């Protein structure tokens, strides 16, 4: 048996806002995630610069579902 | 030659509380955040100074962004 993929399909697609700071690798985000700790943690080590760096904002996702 | 003495507290009792917030997050990196603002007196310095110590951490693993 067999059972094919899926695609979300959430009407909102990816979307992300990054604001530097210009102090000490300061930056604000705001995301359409499910997961803004994650989303802080790989910033941070994208960047080389501690976790307290990076702020994560999330209001609401135009749709998720895991994706 | 002229001396001074000068009283210590608000003279309202009620001003006379203060909040802290703090996270650590999962790099061991800490975020505080306190009621204070900084105008130049170094009262984030002194935060950060004191966090360091109470912690036993060196201060560069601490952090202050904004009130
Ligand atoms: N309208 C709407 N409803 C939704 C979501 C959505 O994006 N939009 N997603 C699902 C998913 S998919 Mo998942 O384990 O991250 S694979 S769990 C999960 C679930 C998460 O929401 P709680 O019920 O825990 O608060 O919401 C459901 N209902
Ligand atoms: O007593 C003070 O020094 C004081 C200072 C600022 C505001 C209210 C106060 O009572």
Same mark, same amino acid.
């Given at each position: 048996?067999? &059972?094919? #993929? +899926? ?11 990054? &604001? ?8 604000? $985000?705001?995301?359409? /995630? ?5 989303? +802080? ?12 760096? &990076? $702020? ?7 749709? #998720?579902?895991?994706? | &030659?002229?001396?001074?003495?000068? !009283? ?17 997050? /999962? ?9 204070? /603002?900084?105008?130049? +007196? !170094? ?5 950060? +100074? ?18």
């Amino acid at each position: 048996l067999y &059972i094919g #993929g +899926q695609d979300h399909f959430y009407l909102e697609t990816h979307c992300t806002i990054a &604001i530097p700071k210009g102090e000490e690798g300061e930056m604000e $985000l705001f995301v359409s /995630t499910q997961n803004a700790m994650k989303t +802080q943690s790989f910033v941070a080590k994208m960047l080389g610069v501690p976790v307290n760096r &990076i $702020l994560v904002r999330v209001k609401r996702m135009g749709g #998720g579902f895991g994706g | &030659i002229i001396p001074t003495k000068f !009283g210590i507290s608000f003279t309202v009792p009620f001003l006379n509380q203060a909040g802290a917030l703090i996270h650590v997050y /999962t790099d061991g990196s800490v975020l505080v955040s306190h009621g204070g /603002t900084e105008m130049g +007196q !170094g009262l984030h310095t002194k935060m950060v +100074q004191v966090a360091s110590k109470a912690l036993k951490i060196p201060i560069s693993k601490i952090y202050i962004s904004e009130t």
